[PDB]
Amino acid sequence: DGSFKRKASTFRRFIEKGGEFEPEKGRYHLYVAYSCPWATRTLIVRKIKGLEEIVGVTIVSPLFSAHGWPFGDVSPFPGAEADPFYNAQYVRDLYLRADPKYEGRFTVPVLWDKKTETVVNNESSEIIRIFNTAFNEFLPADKAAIHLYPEALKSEIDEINEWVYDTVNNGVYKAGFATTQQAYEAAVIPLFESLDRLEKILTGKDYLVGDQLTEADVRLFVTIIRFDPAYVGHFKCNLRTIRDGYPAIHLWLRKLYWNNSAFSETCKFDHIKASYYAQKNVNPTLVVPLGPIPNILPLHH
C-alpha cells in the first residue's frame, strides 16, 4: 500500500450547562505542541476569544520521541514546559490517567478537565467550536459575541472545510508520510490542485468566507504557515511554494499573521521546524535546514 491513514479522535465530549462538563473558569486545560497545526488551531482561537485567563495551556516539547510527546522537563526545548498537574512525563500519561485501557493514539491537542482528570475532547475541530460559546458567560458581551462558526455562514464553511481538510490539512501528511512513489503522487497532486482552487477563492479577498474571519481561515492557516518553512522540503510538497507560486494565498497568509496577533504569537517556527525535521523515518540525519529565509515574508504593506 504505502499510503497514510489518519485515525479518528475518540474523546468527543463538550462543555455545556447541565452537562458532564459545566462551563467553569480555571477548570479546563489545553495541552498542545507549538509544532502541531491541529493543536495550534486551539491556541489561535483561545487568543481570538480572549480565553487566556479562563482556559490554561501547557506547551509540550516539540521533540517527539519513541514515547510520544515529552514534557519540557523530559526533553528541554525553549518554550517547552513541564506538566503542572500530574508530574506527567509524556502526553500518554494523561490519556492513561483518564483511562488505563485507552488504546487510541496519544495526540495533542488535549482539552483536559482538571476536576475529574479526564480528556473532554481531543478533536481539534470540536475544541475550537467549544471555544466559540462554552465560556461566553466569563467574557464581556463583545468578546462573547465573537463566533468563528456562525449559523449564516455554516454551510459555506463546511463545504470548503471538507476538501481543505481532506486534501490540504491532511494532504500534506499523506504526501510526506507516503512510503511509495504512487502513494506520494496520489496525495501531492490533489494537494496542489486544491491550492489552485484556494488561490482563485482568495483572489482579491481577505478571508475565505463572508469577508470575515471564520474557522475555515484558522484551519487552513495552520497548514499554510507551515508550508514553505517545512512541508515543501521535508514532506516533498514542492511543485511550487506559497511565497512564489500562490500570490493570493500568500497575501491572505501574511495579513492573518501580521495583522492578527492571535496568529503570530501562537506561531513558533523553531518548534515547527525542529519537530518535522526530527522525524527519523523521513530525515535520518536529523539536520534542520537553515532556510527558507525568512519563515514568512513581511506584509510589505
Place this chain on the structure above:
Amino acid sequence: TFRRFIEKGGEFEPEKGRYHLYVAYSCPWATRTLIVRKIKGLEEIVGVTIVSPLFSAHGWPFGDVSPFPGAEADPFYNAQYVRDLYLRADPKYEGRFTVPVLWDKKTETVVNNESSEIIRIFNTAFNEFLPADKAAIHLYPEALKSEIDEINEWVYDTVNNGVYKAGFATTQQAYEAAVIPLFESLDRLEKILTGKDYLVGDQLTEADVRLFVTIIRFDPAYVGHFKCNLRTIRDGYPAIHLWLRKLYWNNSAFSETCKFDHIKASYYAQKNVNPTLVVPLGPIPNILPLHHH
C-alpha cells in the same frame, strides 16, 4: 592517477572514433564533458555511453544492470559497473570509480578521469577534425586564464563541492558550516552576473560550464534533498537565474545534455539521506522559460 592528455606525438594521438566518454547524466562533473563535447561539435568524433543514474553498492551500473530510460549498456566490454572499466585498465587500481571516464578504445585504458582536464583537452586536441567555427572555440583562452582560475577556485570549493558538503553533512554544525558559505558565494555570483551574460570576459568560458552544472541542479534537487534552501535560484537570484536560462535555452549544448529525470532519480535514491526513496514531483518546471518574470 589517470591524468593523461591527447596530443600529437604523444601516448594518445588525436584520432576519430578512438576515444569514448562514460558518463552519468545526473553527475555534474561528468555533465561538464557532455556540454563541452557538444559546444565543440565532437559528437561524431568522441563517443558516449550513458550509465544508469541509479548508483548502487557496486557503483555506477550500466543500463542493462539497472535499467532507466536513456541509460545504455556498455558497447565494448560487457561491463556491468564502471569499476569494471577501471580494473580492465589496471587490475591494481585502488582509486575511486568515478565518471566521467575519457577512455581509449584502442589500448583499453583510461586516458583521463578528471572532468576539469577532459573539457580542456576538448578545447584543441581534435581541432583537425572540426569545421573552422567549431575549431576556433576555446573555453580556456590564454587572455582570460587568470580570471577563470580566480573564480573557479571559490566556485569549485564553496558551490560545486559546497552543495555536497552541505547535503552529505551528518551534524547540524557541519551542515551550517557548508551551506552558509555556499549562499555567500551565490550572493557573490549574483553581483558578478548582474547585467552580464557570462562570468568572465563577456564570452562563454569553462567557468560558465563549471558553474552551470551545479546551478542547473539547484532548484530541482539541491534545495530539497541537500537542504540548500535559504532561498532558491528562481526566486532568490534573478541575475543568476537569467544567466542560467540564457545558457539553457539559447545553447543546445546546455539543454540537450540536461536530463532532469536522471538528475532527480540519482539524488533521491540516496538511501542514507532519503530513506523513503520517494522522488518529489516538483519543482514545476525544472527550469522556467527564458521570457518569464
